[PDB]
Structures are given as C-alpha cells and as structure tokens.
Amino acid sequence: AEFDIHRSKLDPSSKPLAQVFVSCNFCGKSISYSKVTSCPGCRKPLPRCALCLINMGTPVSSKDKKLAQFNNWFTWCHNCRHGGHAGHMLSWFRDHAECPVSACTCKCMQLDT
Amino acid sequence: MFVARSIAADHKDLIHDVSFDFHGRRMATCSSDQSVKVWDKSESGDWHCTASWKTHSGSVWRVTWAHPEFGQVLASCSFDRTAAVWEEIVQSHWVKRTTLVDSRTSVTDVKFAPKHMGLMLATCSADGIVRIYEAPDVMNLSQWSLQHEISCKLSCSCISWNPSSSRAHSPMIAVGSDDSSPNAMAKVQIFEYNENTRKYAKAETLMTVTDPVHDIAFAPNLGRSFHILAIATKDVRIFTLKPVRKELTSSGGPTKFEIHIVAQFDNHNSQVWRVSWNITGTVLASSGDDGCVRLWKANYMDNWKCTGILKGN
Amino acid sequence: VLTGRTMHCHLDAPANAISVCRDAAQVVVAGRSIFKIYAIEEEQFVEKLNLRVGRKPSLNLSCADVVWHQMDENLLATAATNGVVVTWNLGRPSRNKQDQLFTEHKRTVNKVCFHPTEAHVLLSGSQDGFMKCFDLRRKDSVSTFSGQSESVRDVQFSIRDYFTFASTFENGNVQLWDIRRPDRCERMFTAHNGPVFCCDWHPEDRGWLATGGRDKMVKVWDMTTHRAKEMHCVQTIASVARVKWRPECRHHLATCSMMVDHNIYVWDVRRPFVPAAMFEEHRDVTTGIAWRHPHDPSFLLSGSKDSSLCQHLFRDASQPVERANPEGLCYGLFGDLAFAAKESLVAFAGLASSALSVFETEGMRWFVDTAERYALAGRPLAELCDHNAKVARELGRNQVAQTWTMLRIIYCSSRLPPDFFGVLVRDMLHFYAEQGDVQMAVSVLIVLGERVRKDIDEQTQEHWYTSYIDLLQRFRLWNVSNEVVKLSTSRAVSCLNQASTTLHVNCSHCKRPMSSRGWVCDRCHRCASMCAVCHHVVKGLFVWCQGCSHGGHLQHIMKWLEGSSHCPAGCGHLCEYS
C-alpha cells in the first residue's frame, strides 16, 4: 500500500483500482462525490441503518477535527445486500452471527473466513 | 438526596426556558436577551456552551427539541409574534430553516407532536388561537402548511400533546389559560381529533379549575389504559381521564371521559409556576414561588405523597 | 398638577400629527383632511374651532407636520405636502387665520420646528435634501443648509444651546449644525443602518440625544466629547417611528412604531430588553404621541390613523414584567433535574438576573443492567426461566425472580384442567404493564411465545412493544432493540425493520448494476469486490467510502485507517480528514 501511494504520487498516468459504487434507488445515479441524508440528484432519502433506523449519509467536499469518522461509513453484506453504519454492524456481528434484518438467514461475517 | 451543581450561564437577562434533548446529553436555554444557547456535557461532566446566536427581535419564551430521527432541529417561539425552526449543519452552524408569522399577537408557546404522528408543530398565541403546522416532506424543512386552527375564546398560555402511542387513542391536545377576569369561567379545555370529520373538536372541559393556569403537562403513557394530567395554579392539581366503552351505535362524536381529581397540594404556599414529569411518568416535579422544587409520587394505594424537597444554592 | 382620566375620542378623518399648547388645555390635530383644536376637560374633550375653513380644497391644506409655538400661544405652523409652509395666527379675527405662506421648497416638506425662545425663527426639512430657515420678521429669510445627503427626516433645536440643532437623513447619517455658520456642518456621524426617522434631546441632560430609525433599534448618543459615544441601545419589534423622553424621569422614553405594530411602549434604558410599560388602546397604527405637560409625567396623548385620539394615564398601562413567568424546570433521561430561577427568589436592580442549577442523583441503572443480560431465545423454556430468575435475583428484585420461577413451574411440567392458569397469566401481564414496567411484560411475552399470544389483543401488544423499543433507543441500546424487533410476535413490529434497508451496487468499470447473489461482473467478467488491502475477493461484509469510492474488508480497512490517513488504494483522498 505504501508503494502504491508513492507510485500514484509520482506517476499520474497510473489509474487506481476499480471497485463498486452505490446507486440511488429512484434516480439510479451514483451517490458519490441540501441535507446530508438526501440524494444529491433527486433529493430523496437514502437507505437507513438497519440498527439505528436513521438514514445514512456523510458530508462531502493534522491535529484537527475529523469530518467523517470511520464509524459512519456505509457497510453492507455482499450476499444479503443488507447493511448500515460501520460501528453498529461491527458491534452487532461481534455479539451475534446472523443478518440483523428480519427474515434473513445469511451468516454474513462467516462467509469471508 | 440530590446533589446540586451551579452553572454559569452568562445570560444578559432572565432565563426563561431550559429543555433537554432526546438522548439526555444536550441542553438548550432561551432567555429574554433575544438569545438561545446550547450546552453539551463532556466526560468530566462539565457543561460547555457550543453555540450562542441571536434569534428573534423580542423576548424568547419557549424553545423545544425535535426527535433525532429528523435531525438536530429546534423550535422557538418569540414575543415578536413569530415562531422559528432552526437546524444544525456541519463546524457546528445553526441555520434558520423556517419562519412562521401567521399570528398577529404574541406567540405564547410552541411544541412538537409525538413522533408516530409525523413531523407536526403546534403554536398557541395570546389572542386565543392554536395553530397546527405540518411538513409533508421530512427532507425539506423549508416548507410548512397550515392544517388546523382552533379558537379558544380565551387567551392561551400553555399547550400539551398526549404522548400516548397506542392506536386506541386519537390524538389529543390540552390548552390552558391565564386570564384573571372576575368571572369564574373554565380554564382548561381538551380537544380531540376525529378521523371521520378530519377536524379537532372540543372533547372535555375542566370546570373545577377557575384560577389562572401557568402550566399543564400530560404524563407519558408507557402502557397505561387511561390518561394522567397535571395542572399548575395557585396550587398543584392532578387529574385522571378514563375513556368509557364506545357504544354499539358507533357515534361519530368525541369520545366521552370520566374525570376525577386524585391529588391537590398547596405546600408551596404561593403561585406554582412549573410542572414536569420524569421519563417513565411516575414522579412529578413542581417548582413554585417559594424558590424550592418538590417531588411527588403515589404508592400502590393511589395516595400521592411528597418524596423530596430541593433548595437552590 | 393636571387631573383627569384615560379617555378616547373619535375624529372624522385620519390624523397624522398632534401638538399641545403650553397650558395643557388645548391640543391641535392635523392630517390629510382634518385640522382642528380640542379642549380636554376632566370628563371629555370638545372641538373649539376647525382650521378647515372654506369649501375650496387646497394643496396647502394637506398638512403633514404641525407645531404650536412655544413662545406665543397664538402661533401655529404647518408643513403641507405641496412643498409649502403656512403660518396661522389665532389672533386674526378672520375665519381663515392664515398669516404667511412660504413656497421656498419644491419637494414635500417633512418636518418643521420652532425656536424655544425666539418667536421669529423656524426650521424646515424637506425631501429636497436641503434645510430652510425662516425669519418671521419678513426680512430676507432665505438660509439653506445643504447636507449633501438623502432626504431630511427630522430636525430639532437643542434645548440648552441657542444656536445648535441636529438633523437626520434617510441615508442613515446625523449632522449637528449651528445656525450662525451655514457654510459647513459641525458634526456628522452614521447613527443607524438605514434611514433615521426620529430624534430628541434629553430634557435634563445637556449632551444626550436619542435617535431612532427603521433598524428597529433606538440608541442614545453622548455629544459632550469631540467624538460622539453610544451609551444605550434598545431593540423593538418593528420600525421605530417616533420617540419622546418622559418628563421628570431621567431614564424613560415613550416610543411609537410606524407599521405592523399598534401598541405604544415606555422603555427604561437601564433595562433595554423588556418594555417598562405598554399601551394597547389603539387598533390602527399610532401616528402622533406627545406628553401633555412638560413637567407632568402622568398623562400622554396619542392620535392614530383610525381617526381616534386618546389621552392615557401612566398608572393604567400594562406591565409585562409583573406577569412574566420567572422559572424554568425540566427533567432528564438520567434523573437529572435542570432548574433555572430568578436571583431574587433564590437568595440598579437585582431582579434582572437568574441562576441555573442541575440536581443529580448519587437513577435507573437496573433497567440497563436487566436489558443487557436477559436471555430471550436459543434455549428451552426451563433454562430461560432459570437464567432470568437468577439474573433478577442478582440485582435484588426478588419478586421478579419469584415470578420467573412460578412461570417455569406453571408451564414446564388426575390433573388440573389444561388452561387453568391462563387468566392469572394475563392478569399478571396487565399488572406489570399498568405501572410502567413494560420491560418485564415484553420479556415474558417473548419468552412464552404462542402459549399466551392469543389472549392479548394486538393493539395492546403493539403499544407495549413500541414503548419498550422507544425506551431502549433513548438509552442507546441498539443490539437489544434489534433483538426485540427480530423476535417480535406482532406483524407490524416484525416488519418495522425491513423498510428501505437494501442497497444497490454497480461496477464502476462497466457502470452496470450487479446481481444480488454474485461477486463477478456479468459483462466485465472482473472481480469488482476485491479488497483494496488484501487483494482478495470479498464475500461478506464490505465497507465503502463515499469520497473516493474505495473500500474493502471491514477489519482490514479499520486497522489500516488506525495507522494512516490515506486511501489504501492510493488515490490521494484523505477519506477521514485529519
């Protein structure tokens, strides 16, 4: 990872790795980069954490404050497609072993190891 | 016994209202210096002010929080015949989202509705009018609509929603007055919403209350099958409302109730100013003109007795 | 002193200006179409003689400002809307008491003023941006002061000085001038943001001038020093129209507004946040206010646009401060009690401050502890009952433990009838729910399951479930809340958790949406879910950043971000700024 950072800094030609991105249910556009919890395009609400029942979202644009803590990022199970906040689901799967959504049987955290 | 802790507020005038948030970690104080301040506590337990911005042009009477599901939202009523709805946006900046100016007289009080009813607001003015505003889009706080308005024939001074979340109780709002006319008229009127007619109608009236009323409060239901109301006057009164079984005729009128008074205390020996319930609706706190706070609770035989007396400083 | 009572009378036309004589016996009222003098008696007032003589209307008749000479009781001055100034001499035997007319101005004359001692000098400020002085000696009286600013609003002589006056302009500037040096002004300063509408010297102080404009603020200026100093500032609820110092009181001023509001206020500068007294008699916008006698602080006079003029007594005013609520009280989730009270009730004026205190308990921890260690599923009924009973006995709630044990005996088994205890169980549930202990009722309902589900109507079950969930969310116990929701026996509560919790993901290379049970792109044939750190395919939990569209395994990303502040894919984005 350190070598990759160094190479990307020195060589602009290299394109970083390609991965997945989240899309709005209604507009269908990407939500990557006016309330935070709204789609930038359609202004409709975003999906909500399965534990806190609050719509997810993150502000978008050194011994200072942190705008977007790690505990508020999007997390989801790549098989059951259920997800929420990082901290909530981390705790829930630390104490349990089933998808937190009702009527879901995926053992989401046991799939990866 | 409780332990006291003083806080340096640095308000240039009288502090009128203090209210906690939903999670019991943040506090909001509105004063007569046209100012509202927000306090947050830390790990050490000390309270620090995190915001202080001028809001209105006249005195600020009441400030209340909204449910966190809609975000960090505050509502304030002022003496300049306005109500304001503010939001917090990320540092921490408080931005005026909406202003309601439909009233032509001083706005006496403002309060949010229970969560299960949506995002609704109720404001009572000094001319005797209670207005209910609703935001159809929870994602756009800048737009509000006027749903209902009620005239009470007397100057209003305080309102309270019924916090019951059951599906067997229609929404209820109680309105009190602080008129001092020599005529011994009613001071507390309770309206109920009728689904069929889609209109609030007068449901009950407390004829035994004739003194000016300074505050009223419903108690949190939390599973009971009747309602408890607390009224502050020259003394402290507690009433119970038990709905009667609906007749098989299926009348479309307001539900009938049986009204009883279960406690009347006058230990303050003065005008009782404020009343408030605890979280579970089991302990009542009353503050009067003696400069002391009193706590009240009922035993298993339904006898209300004082349990604690607190004194400033 | 003067005696009387509060009394109102109705005019025939809207009133725009009022003035008082020195004897406090007659008041002149003028407007667009009204011009009359009234004698006020202890019972009521009566018109004496109207100045609307002659059926022919004149542009000079539409007067906006009328002043009664403070030197002679027979001299009146009016400023018309046609840019003319008219003098009226009651001593003239003619019905039309018009004496002299001066058409020096071309725009509307806004304000006119007399001299306190000289009975032959008048000042006029108009919309032309100039100020004109007039000598009643009929000599060459032309004397124009050009303020080089917007239209002039108010002009006033000083009471102590003989040659000094002040002017306010619609640009927001105040100029202090002298009459002996028309060449240039003496002082100039910006008093308000926006036009200034009124000004007044302090009747007793020799260097205090109060100003007021549309900025809804009235500020007192000190003029003794070379640089003017602001002393006090008061905020009203509307644009301040007119201000008058109260006689015999050093720190009291009456104010009337121009729009929106109709009430007249009396403020004390020492407490600039609440009015000292209020008058709400009028129904239309107040237009003219004047203290009756220069040495009597008892009576006030006010005429409004509703063709009504009333005399008010100070003792009859409303006092908001005397009826204000002086305390605030609130409860907290942790048993804390916030209490703010007036300083006087706890221990210039000690009644303008308050003390704020919080009372704490050395309060409901049993709730949290019980909610965290109860067992609700995964084991047979007897084991659950025993475990819950032991937990309850640990915290000292003996009756709950006995209830759990009795439940185990009743259900977990020449016999009793099969449903001998149903009524008792239902009544126990109701009893525990009727005193705010929803936790026990909900726990029992979940544990028992179908053995008691059909004896309770759905509405009560939903009520209990919602109350318990709300309390859990208040205390911020998400795991227990979700556990209750999953195991709920009510359809609505069970379905509460499935509302819009499904995410849609697309490959960033082909931009196409992916299936719900695979990790390979259908068109790209690429592993779109390769962790940015370990470079392996991710099957289960995936954490994603909204900024750089990168992510990976939950624990990998967490550990990496604990050590640095760069996107591990090497994009440059600081995904967790600082």
Ligand SMILES: [Zn+2]
């Ligand atoms: Zn969208």
Ligand SMILES: [Zn+2]
């Ligand atoms: Zn799932």
Ligand SMILES: [Zn+2]
């Ligand atoms: Zn899954």
Ligand SMILES: [Zn+2]
């Ligand atoms: Zn969450």
Ligand SMILES: [Zn+2]
């Ligand atoms: Zn692809």
Ligand SMILES: [Zn+2]
């Ligand atoms: Zn990995």
Ligand SMILES: [Zn+2]
């Ligand atoms: Zn990145």
Ligand SMILES: [Zn+2]
């Ligand atoms: Zn990023």
